[PDB]
Amino acid sequence: MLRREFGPKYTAKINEAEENWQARAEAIKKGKKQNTWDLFEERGYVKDTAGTKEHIAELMRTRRIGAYVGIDPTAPSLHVGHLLPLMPLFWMYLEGYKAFTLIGGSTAKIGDPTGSSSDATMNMTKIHYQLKKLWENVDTQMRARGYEADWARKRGIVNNNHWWNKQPMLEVLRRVGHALRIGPMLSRDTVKNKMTQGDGVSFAEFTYPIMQGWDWFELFYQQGVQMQIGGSDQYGNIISGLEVVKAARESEPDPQERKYVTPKTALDECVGFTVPLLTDSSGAKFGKSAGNAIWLDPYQTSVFDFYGYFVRRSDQEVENLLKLFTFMPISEITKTMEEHIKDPSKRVAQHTLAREVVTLVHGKQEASAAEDQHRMMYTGQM
Amino acid sequence: MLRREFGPKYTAKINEAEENWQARAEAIKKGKKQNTWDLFEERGYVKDTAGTKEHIAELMRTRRIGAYVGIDPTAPSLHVGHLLPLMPLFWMYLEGYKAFTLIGGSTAKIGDPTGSSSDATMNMTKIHYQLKKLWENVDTQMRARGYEADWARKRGIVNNNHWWNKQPMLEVLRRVGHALRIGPMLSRDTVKNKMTQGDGVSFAEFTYPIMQGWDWFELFYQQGVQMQIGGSDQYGNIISGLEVVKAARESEPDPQERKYVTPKTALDECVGFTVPLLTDSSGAKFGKSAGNAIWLDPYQTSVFDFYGYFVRRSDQEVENLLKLFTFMPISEITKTMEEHIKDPSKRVAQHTLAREVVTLVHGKQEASAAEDQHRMMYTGQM
Ligand SMILES: N[C@@H](Cc1ccc(O)cc1)C(=O)O
Numbered sequence: 094m095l096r097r098e099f100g101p102k103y104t105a106k107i108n109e110a111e112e113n114w115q116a117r118a119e120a121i122k123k124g125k126k127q128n129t130w131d132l133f134e135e136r137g138y139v140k141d142t143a144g145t146k147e148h149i150a151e152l153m154r155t156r157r158i159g160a161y162v163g164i165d166p167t168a169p170s171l172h173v174g175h176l177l178p179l180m181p182l183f184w185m186y187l188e189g190y191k192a193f194t195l196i197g198g199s200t201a202k203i204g205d206p207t208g209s210s211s212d213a214t215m216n217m218t219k220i221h222y223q224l225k226k227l228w229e230n231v232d233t234q235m236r237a238r239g240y241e242a243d244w245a246r247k248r249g250i251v252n253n254n255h256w257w258n259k260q261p262m263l264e265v266l267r268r269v270g271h272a273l274r275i276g277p278m279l280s281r282d283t284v285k286n287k288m289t290q291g292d293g294v295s296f297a298e299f300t301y302p303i304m305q306g307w308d309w310f311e312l313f314y315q316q317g318v319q320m321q322i323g324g325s326d327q328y329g330n331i332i333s334g335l336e337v338v339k340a341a342r343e344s345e346p347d348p349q350e351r352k353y354v355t356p357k358t359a360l361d362e363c364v365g366f367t368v369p370l371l372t373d374s375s376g377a378k379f380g381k382s383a384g385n386a387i388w389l390d391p392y393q394t395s396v397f398d399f400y401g402y403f404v405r406r407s408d409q410e411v412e413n414l415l416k417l418f419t420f421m422p423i424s425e426i427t428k429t430m431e432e433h434i435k436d437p438s439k440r441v442a443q444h445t446l447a448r449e450v451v452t453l454v455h456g457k458q459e460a461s462a463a464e465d466q467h468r469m470m471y472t473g474q475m
Numbered sequence: 476m477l478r479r480e481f482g483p484k485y486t487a488k489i490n491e492a493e494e495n496w497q498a499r500a501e502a503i504k505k506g507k508k509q510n511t512w513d514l515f516e517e518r519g520y521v522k523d524t525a526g527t528k529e530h531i532a533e534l535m536r537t538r539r540i541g542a543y544v545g546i547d548p549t550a551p552s553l554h555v556g557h558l559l560p561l562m563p564l565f566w567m568y569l570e571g572y573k574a575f576t577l578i579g580g581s582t583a584k585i586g587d588p589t590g591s592s593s594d595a596t597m598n599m600t601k602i603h604y605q606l607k608k609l610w611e612n613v614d615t616q617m618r619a620r621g622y623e624a625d626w627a628r629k630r631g632i633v634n635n636n637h638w639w640n641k642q643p644m645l646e647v648l649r650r651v652g653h654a655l656r657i658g659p660m661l662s663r664d665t666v667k668n669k670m671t672q673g674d675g676v677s678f679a680e681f682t683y684p685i686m687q688g689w690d691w692f693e694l695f696y697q698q699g700v701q702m703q704i705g706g707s708d709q710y711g712n713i714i715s716g717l718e719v720v721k722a723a724r725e726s727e728p729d730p731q732e733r734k735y736v737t738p739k740t741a742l743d744e745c746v747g748f749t750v751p752l753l754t755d756s757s758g759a760k761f762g763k764s765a766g767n768a769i770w771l772d773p774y775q776t777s778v779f780d781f782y783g784y785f786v787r788r789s790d791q792e793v794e795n796l797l798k799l800f801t802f803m804p805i806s807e808i809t810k811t812m813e814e815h816i817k818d819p820s821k822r823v824a825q826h827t828l829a830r831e832v833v834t835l836v837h838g839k840q841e842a843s844a845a846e847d848q849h850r851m852m853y854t855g856q857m
Pocket residue numbers: 162163164165195196197200205304305306308309324327330
């Protein structure tokens with residue numbers, strides 16, 4: 094598909110960015126530079142892919158694509174469980190892609206089927222605040238990890254209420270509703286599970302993945318977003334989302350828009366993947382400690398208790414978590430584990446994980462103070 | 476539910492209309508006047524009811540309700556098959572109810588699952604034209620059948636593009652999507668038929684009865700329409716429509732609107748019914764002659780051929796069709812059949828049916844000329 098028209102000044106910068114991206118692409122082809130896709134694989138972020146690995150790898154190599162993660166504001170704080178899909182997104186941002194965190198302002202009212210507006214508006218506000226705060230810390234870490242400035246690197250926070258507040262139903266149905274079949278939607282475990290056992294599925298719940306697909310269409314249209322990264326349970330939604338985006342791009346009625354939105358080549362298609370489901374060996378969900386989430390908000394979970402959660406991670410899982418939840422180069426993680434196995438009881442690896450994650454969420458100062466506290470002769474049980 | 480506020484002049488007329496309606500209601504209770512519901516039963520219009528017969532009868536007795544029939548403009552002309560659901564609607568209009576023919580301008584693009592916009596806009600225009608023309612002939616017949624003027628009697632033509640062009644999807648999902656379960660929607664023959672055999676069901680097709688339900692909500696809200704009359708195959712849609720309307724009325728967030736839209740009493744609820752499926756004893760669908768519809772448009776089906784269709788109706792079915800497709804009092808139909816059985820070969824009953832239906836669709840002059848032609852010594856085969 095053709096690039097849209099812009100002014101002469103923006104255009105020059107876009108061309109230079111494309112030239113830079115292609116030098117990067119050739120460096121990857123020659124093996125001088127690791128493809129961010131191969132980084133995803135090496136660090137353990139890839140569970141399921143919508144699109145082949147080879148497809149996604151070559152898209153990532155050849156194009157400075159946009160990617161996104163959606164988050165439904167179902168509570169006033171994010172918790173550490175939310176961090177997992179965000180990490181590969183943050184890596185792409187560090188690498189100079191365009192990366193978006195979409196707040197599901199409208200879609201949280203429908204609710205993602207499993208597997209008051211006063212409060213819901215407050216939650217939206219707080220999630221936006223927290224994502225802005227976290228994105229700022231990503232910038233801090235970008236700078237600390239030696240990544241250079243890049244004009245074409247982009248981050249954003251989008252709320253899907255931007256289109257859902259007024260998006261006509263008729264248009265959605267006409268642009269994608271004829272293309273989407275309910276059999277495949279119904280022939281997916283999440284739907285059959287909730288219908289056979291549980292209290293059935295509402296039309297709104299049934300429609301949720303169509304709305305999430307239209308979200309992706311809106312991000313593709315507006316920001317060139319070709320990739321969705323999803324939580325471990327989002328594979329089905331990503332598959333449906335791809336169908337919705339494809340239908341929408343193929344049904345664009347204006348021939349002038351079709352030049353920009355209708356795919357012309359194989360790599361114009363959208364792609365997605367999901368991150369692993371993280372549990373410990375006792376079955377505990379990552380980010381749950383006792384009957385409680387480990388919140389990013391210090392007013393819900395103290396920094397000390399946030400650090401505590403990570404310092405208590407098992408020796409079995411800690412290397413995997415260093416790869417997933419830090420921006421440490423693999424060589425640095427290898428050296429940490431080398432030190433750690435000299436005497437695991439010292440919890441070198443876990444203190445490192447804690448320091449790195451607290452540093453990302455709460456900053457280096459808070460991280461240092463929390464570490465000091467967790468190295469005192471008494472630290473609680475718990 | 477309370478009546479909305481109006482000016483002092485309109486208000487007085489509404490009160491008088493209500494007083495007149497209540498005198499009528501009491502006349503029905505005392506057996507001086509036939510309930511229009513019992514007229515429906517006597518003339519053969521009732522197939523299935525959404526709501527009990529007793530419910531619908533008492534609603535009709537006690538309230539000057541609004542009723543509607545929806546027609547999807549899938550072709551440039553209506554045909555005589557369309558007349559069947561319209562006839563009880565026209566009877567209500569004659570009796571002083573409020574009666575609407577809704578054109579499915581937006582919903583024809585989705586298509587009612589079974590059991591170009593240049594052309595589709597042209598079809599919309601032509602259907603509106605034809606319905607205006609037919610409604611005018613209803614007025615003519617109203618006057619010829621001795622019905623007196625009534626300020627509160629009302630007819631209208633509405634196109635659902637009036638709301639569908641801009642109606643936000645989010646609002647529809649929030650107001651009725653949590654209340655509607657896909658199991659009952661899926662556990663209906665039309666859906667299972669088209670999914671098991673046939674090429675499946677699109678999301679748009681699956682959503683069609685929700686849109687038709689919102690249509691009814693819009694007509695309830697705007698015009699006090701509590702009744703839908705449907706074609707023989709519309710029972711499932713009417714049941715779903717009732718659920719959508721109920722959900723919408725119960726979910727109204729504004730307490731000032733709830734006084735008007737949220738039901739307070741048993742008779743505030745909506746109701747519907749369907750008309751019979753008409754076939755002859757050879758299995759031919761009513762209004763199909765050879766492989767062709769009998770169109771209301773003289774440019775597609777000549778008046779002579781329209782009359783011809785009715786004059787050829789069987790002796791077995793003709794009394795039933797006189798009741799369904801004419802405004803003849805039962806006593807008049809009884810006298811016609813009395814004359815007819817003296818010598819059926821003269822086709823007295825069928826010429827009467829033809830005259831009456833042609834008179835409604837094409838006018839008395841065209842009816843007279845066509846009868847003259849069909850009484851010539853040669854009339855064609857066919
Ligand atoms: N469905 C995702 C969140 C999400 C919302 C909107 C989107 O467009 C994408 C993702 C979840 O709840 O886990």
